[PDB]
Amino acid sequence: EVARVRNLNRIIMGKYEIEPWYFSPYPIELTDEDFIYIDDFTLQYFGSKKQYERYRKKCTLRHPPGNEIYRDDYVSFFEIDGRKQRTWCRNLCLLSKLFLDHKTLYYDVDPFLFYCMTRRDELGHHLVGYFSKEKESADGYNVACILTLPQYQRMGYGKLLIEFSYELSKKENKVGSPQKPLSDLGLLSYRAYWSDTLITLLVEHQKEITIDEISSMTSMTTTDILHTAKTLNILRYYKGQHIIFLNEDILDRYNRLKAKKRRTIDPNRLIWKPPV
């Protein structure tokens, strides 16, 4: 007799079989099998294909459980109150933990809002990623955690999540920055976003822009703006204040950016008011 006690080595989510990057504390028994089923709508986990199918045939909505506060021809965003959808958000946090070195206790979702992004096509809604945000952040962080599901990574979705998070801050008349410390993947994504943002502003808005105009237009913090401007070598002093300025490098980067034909968030489609 060899009794095998296996780790969760693959999660089955729709047609995808995904390998976890890190341990996540799913409250399930460890056995000789190394898989679980994750319903791609409810995010519920099942040790058994039969149990999973039994619940799959139930009538459920085929998108995340919150208000659709943004909808364009490409994506929707749903705003979910952790306290109002405890089970679903707990399920989302267990799933997210498989791809994070650390995450706050998955069970305690009440303090968070979750902004969940779906792709819509002939088959309906497909959750591709989300960011959470503290209802009340002492440090003014505008994102707590952010995640694109591995099967959808490196398709541009992460950047859309980040862009959306700043559209909320702008509507709030606040600057914001993601919670630190940031994973390496998170930080590199933010740096690319910050860089594309300044580059786009310089070409489409104004050849020279003060740090405070940038902040007003983007909701980026002074610190993130300065760090990014220094990396791009575009920090100067002009008419008595610090600015960023356009040069041939920036223009070239912009053209390479446009050439990629990437989707962006349309602020006019965000139908949302801060809690006030």
Ligand SMILES: CC(C)(COP(=O)(O)OP(=O)(O)OC[C@H]1O[C@@H](n2cnc3c(N)ncnc32)[C@H](O)[C@@H]1OP(=O)(O)O)[C@@H](O)C(=O)NCCC(=O)NCCS
């Ligand atoms: C951080 C994270 C959300 C980024 O998500 P993502 O959707 O992969 O991000 P994007 O696709 O917008 O950009 C990532 C890369 O893919 C590339 N990419 C995007 N679209 C592409 C396309 N159509 N073809 C080729 N490459 C593409 C980008 O250029 C970028 O490449 P680079 O890093 O070499 O510059 C993701 O890595 C993740 O969920 N990580 C684990 C969770 C985590 O660590 N979160 C941190 C907060 S707690």
